[PDB]
Design a protein around this nucleic acid. Sequence first.
RNA 1: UUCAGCGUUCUUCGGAAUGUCGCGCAUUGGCA
Lengths: 288, 210, 210, 125, 135
Amino acid sequence: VYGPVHIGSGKIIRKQEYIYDRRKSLAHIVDGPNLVKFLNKKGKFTAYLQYLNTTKERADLYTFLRQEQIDTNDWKTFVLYTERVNQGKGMNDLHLFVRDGRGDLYIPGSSLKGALRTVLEGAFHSLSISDSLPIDPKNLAIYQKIDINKELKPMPLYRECVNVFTMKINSDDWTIEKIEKQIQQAYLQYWNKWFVGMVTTPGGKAFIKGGGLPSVLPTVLFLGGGTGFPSKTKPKEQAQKDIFAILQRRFRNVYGKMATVPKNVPMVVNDSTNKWYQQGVCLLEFQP
Amino acid sequence: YSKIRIVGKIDVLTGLHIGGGGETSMIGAIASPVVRDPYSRLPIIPGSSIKGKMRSLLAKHIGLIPGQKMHNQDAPEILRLFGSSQKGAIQSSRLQISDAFFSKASQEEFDKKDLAYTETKFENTISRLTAVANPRQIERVTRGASFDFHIIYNVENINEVMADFENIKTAIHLLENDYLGGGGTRGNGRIRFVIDSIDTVVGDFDSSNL
Amino acid sequence: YSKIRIVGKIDVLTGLHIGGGGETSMIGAIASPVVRDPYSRLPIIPGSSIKGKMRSLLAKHIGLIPGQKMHNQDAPEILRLFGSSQKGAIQSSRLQISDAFFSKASQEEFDKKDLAYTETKFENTISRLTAVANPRQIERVTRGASFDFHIIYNVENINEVMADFENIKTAIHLLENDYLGGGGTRGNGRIRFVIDSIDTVVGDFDSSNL
Amino acid sequence: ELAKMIDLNFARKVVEENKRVKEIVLFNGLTTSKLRNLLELINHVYTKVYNSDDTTLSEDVRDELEYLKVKFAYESGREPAVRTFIEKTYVDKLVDVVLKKNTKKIFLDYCKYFEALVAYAKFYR
Amino acid sequence: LAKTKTGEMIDLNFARKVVEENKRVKDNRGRQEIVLFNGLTTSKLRNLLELINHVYTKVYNSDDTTLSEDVRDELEYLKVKFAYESGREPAVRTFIEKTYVDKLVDVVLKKNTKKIFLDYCKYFEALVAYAKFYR
RNA sequence: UUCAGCGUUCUUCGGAAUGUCGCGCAUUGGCA
């Protein structure tokens, strides 16, 4: 996991749903009911409602708590847990990581299997992949999605990502050497056909200047989300033409209006450490 | 004529999905729910599922005759252990695997931990020609839950009872290495067996060796 | 000559599939419906299934004469208890096992919790050749079902009454291990004859020590 | 004898007209899976209707039938082929008249009509 | 489920009527695109439906016929979230005020019954499905 | 520069039971 990886759980929580300490630089992920009943008991529920009515757009919970000056230990009692944060801008949005019924951090094996199937294509019953081992929640830190299209820009999409598996095959259908060779070939194709376009852009120059890409980057996979359209899907020029056509067909606003073929289709992460990072990249190891 | 009863534990290593239709699903809720005991309203590993999975794994292990268009034609050890239906060669079924119900121990563990025995897993199908995703919600059984599986073996051929129980143990190991229920090729259905006790409920057979 | 009733109950421990017929399957409905008494439209356990299972298990325990082609070749205890039809030497059956109906207690506990009496279990058939499933719907009976089994014993030879009731006890113990109805090899049929009440309905026979 | 006539012969003839061969395509490209899902909902309500013995539809089955109409509308919105099928066979209108009648018999003939639609749709392929 | 003003009842056909009433063709640049609830899209609708989905799953797993205190606090948080979302976007505000969902959650809280919450969930299903249908 | 996210999909496609027994025997009958 050389880059922050977020596997969504279908739940997106707003700024007002959780607390964000800017000075302490930590995000308190809180459940709803505990906070609601705490405010009902302490008389802060009507105050919270008036706060929501006063400022519709920005309703950060931490600023409201500071305005009411509530005790920090009274904050901890309704907080589900806390996470270390990284922002390039209070946070706007937040995407939660996938948690099973018990609540441990884990990457589902289905994500790995789907990524492997996509990269290998170019059936699939023999390759049986199971869930990865549980990970302690402290590795779950909140990162930001940043778009680099000739210029870097922070985005409101903040995502809970992991900080930077048992599998069985049948010998005839799949082989470890063949699948790893195909993974490496797919990564090389991704580098040659699309990564060079981002290298040439000035935003890419800024990214490499700060050492954003790992020096080492073998077997590299795009496990989680935020990786891009070059993944999750040919001659180079024909491929670019197909992506441009499909983007024009689907996204009427950004791509449909503009007729000219961009420099690279598609046109497009900050951490408290000076090194820049990219979302979704992972390094894998297979043992028999 | 002695009946030897196996009782043991099936502890879910990962989430367990065993689908079942006929349930109205809310929009955006679980599209494909797991099987439930209607009484307890709790997840259950049906005896049919366990028996079918074990027979399939064993018949794949020893071998499958080419052009095997039916289950009756198979390795005769499987016919003796699980049954057969061939015209003129019906063999009685010596293994009767029953439903694996939710144990009180794991249920109380979850109740004390404030956990629901099921979980809703978010997945999506990403068509890659257009990179268009179609989402879905699958129900799974929370890891750490335990079921109590209860098989009964009729001792008809005393000479080969040791071989038959060895085959049962081998099939159990095969079920260990593989999954049970829905798509386990993507990470579901992992289970673990803990053999609690083997005894002879009815008859005069000796169960100490087994 | 006395008549003794053994009215009690049967606690199903898993699904119970005693199939039936005479009704065409509506497309997508249950492929194999459970037998129901038409007036009450409730699943029942026909006395024929109980008597057949008891007789088969007891005959297996006592021992079958090699090359037994007819039921009338069983051991004389089995013929004495369950009845025989030979040529000229016909033995009347002292056991009369009636249809076991859905209990009113179980009916009330299923009307509570808003639970259907039967469960449309959803099954498939993975072929050995093409590995393609084949959906099936089986109308099993839920776990909470209790059935009012009713058995009449006729005392003809007072000396053999005790041995006959030991045979009945052995057979019901065998049935507590063995299943009732179809699909028992795949989880169905498990039962337990927990509830009993034996008394002499007609005559002067002593039924306290039975 | 639901409305206007609507019978099993209507089902067979409407599946015949809406059938077009290029491969066989019915109702402007309705796959059998969508029809099977609709029939699965039909089975889910029909089992509850069959188990009850009274001749008058209860409130629970009436609410489930309103839910079934809503699901029909959702399915039509999801795919144009299902919308054209629902409009050509008027299944939702039959649901409405079944609600209006408040009789188990009308629901039973509605289920028979739906099953006939499924059978003839598969047969003509 | 409940009752609105002017004697109109709350039902799934009422959801159909509500979505139809707030439907304007609103042709622009010669293209006929359907708008619902004065600019409301289906993404906000799916977000609200997921918010309902969580509590629906929690109530569906439980066998209790009376709404648990945990589900009551779920519903209070639902009210807070609905108010926040309606304040955020005017289109969502018109949607919420026209469908009377914010009153309906209060009714289901007062009734304190699992069946009533299920009926309210069915009503929200009717809203979202019928909005998808008319589009 | 600041602020804010937004829309997209919500399951899909197939498999919807199959094969087998289809009353048998005994008495009545036919033969003798």
